[PDB]
């Protein structure tokens, strides 16, 4: 998008949800001066791109097509019991079985 | 029910106990022009869908139909690591043995 | 007492400490419009039953009509180095166990 | 000790330290209206039995009769990596020996 | 690299994000009575070796010559599902593995 | 110590990082009413003693002499994901490992 401040950077944090951060994309579009196809294309494009790798991996597990609200009901979880119960045990359950890495 | 804030976005954080959330689910729904039915069709359909995985997995597991008296109760030790006291346990020590899951 | 904002809903959070909580439930009750004995009430019926698992669970132990000191003290433990270093660390082990259950 | 606020519940959180809440204890007593023994007597009863049973447990461990500056410096690593590093692994590796305790 | 409170030590906390301390190093350096030339150079030089072991490791990890938007991305996995699952799901199974070590 | 508040024993909580107690050990130092010898004095004994017992370890363990920049980015490694990935790593197992300890 690379219009100032809204979406070159805007970033979600760990513990930054991917429900309130999307607001820190939206809100902050507001500010940019942009023609509404330049917003629409930085919602689509930079949102997942720039966003939080816990729900990345979730924008492209759900994959592209899946609506926010589709982005919304599974990156929810990402928190600690949500993802981080699935997240540790993970790597946890893998490397313990390294012998044999599916 | 798609009313401005309320049910459009009002949700559920990871950290955020079914309290607090239930609490600006009931407040943002006092800024939406509003009729009795207007709030309480909004309540059973979003809360339950807008809401934390945790409490979400308890609501549903209370089977629909269980007041928010319920909702409230079972979803008490929600919360920051309390409702995990069953989350984190349970998937580190299914996935644990070898392969087998119950 | 079935007072607005004291007992029908007080309750003790997740993350949160006994101490807290009681002086959520105390601080309010003068907030509240009832007579002396409704507050006593109150105090022995609410204060234990509307209050954070790893507490309640532990007044449920220590058990009712046992001084405060004694109630205190058990559930300051709540939090990450008293309650926490030592139950669902214990739980990995009961459910890995989960063969034999006692 | 009886004084107002002070004494009666000055308590340390779980995840409080010794200084935060021993600086809790110390100026919450110079509110009270105490004569300058009551006070000195404060220090010494209240200090040890209502703080957290991280401290608490360190207290009773350096032995009555310590100076609060033995107290302050053992009971500093109140906390996730001086004093937890410590409980949560004895107790795990205390209880898996479990056919055998010392 | 020494200019005003720049660059003697501007450091990302272990818990501060890469991306909340990075801004530091970077309003700092605006922040301070640099030439351009000397700025430029206290990106590089400066903005690796002051910036939390979890990033720093980052750094390493995608290569030196990354573009910052690598170091962005790559250090927006620093945080605990994405980089702390990883240290602390293959710290904890590797010297576990200890008898023998790759 | 004996100066007024920075040095008669200044303390780092758990998770306060060497950017936050420090830091206070730098700024309270100018309050200090010290002569410019004392506070080199000062500087030396009690940055290393009154802090953060997994970073006091770090400024004793690189050995004295080190600059102080060497205990800063040496003593800016302490903290979860970084420091706890590597104690609670061997924590674990080195106590597992207590039929032979090395
Ligand atoms: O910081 P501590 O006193 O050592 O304890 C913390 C704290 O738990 P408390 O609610 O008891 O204070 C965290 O709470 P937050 O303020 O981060 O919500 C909790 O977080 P979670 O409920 O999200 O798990 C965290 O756990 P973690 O470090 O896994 O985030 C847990 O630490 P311990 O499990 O290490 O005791
Ligand atoms: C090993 C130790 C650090 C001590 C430990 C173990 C597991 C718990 C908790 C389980 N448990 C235990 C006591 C009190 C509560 C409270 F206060 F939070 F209700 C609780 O939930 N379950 C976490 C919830 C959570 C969140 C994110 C990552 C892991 C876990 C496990 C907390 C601490």
Redesign the pocket.
């Known amino acids: 998008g690379g219009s100032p401040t809204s979406i070159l950077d805007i970033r979600q944090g760990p513990?930054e949800p991917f429900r309130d951060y999307v607001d820190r994309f939206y809100k902050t579009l507001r500010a940019e001066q942009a023609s509404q196809e330049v917003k629409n294309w930085m919602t689509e494009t930079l949102l997942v791109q720039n966003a939080n790798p816990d729900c990345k991996t979730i924008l492209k597990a759900l994959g592209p097509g899946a609506t926010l609200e589709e982005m919304m009901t599974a990156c929810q979880g990402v928190?600690?019991?949500g993802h981080?119960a699935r997240v540790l045990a993970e790597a946890m359950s893998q490397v313990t079985n390294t012998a044999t890495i599916m």
């Open positions: 513990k928190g600690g019991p981080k």
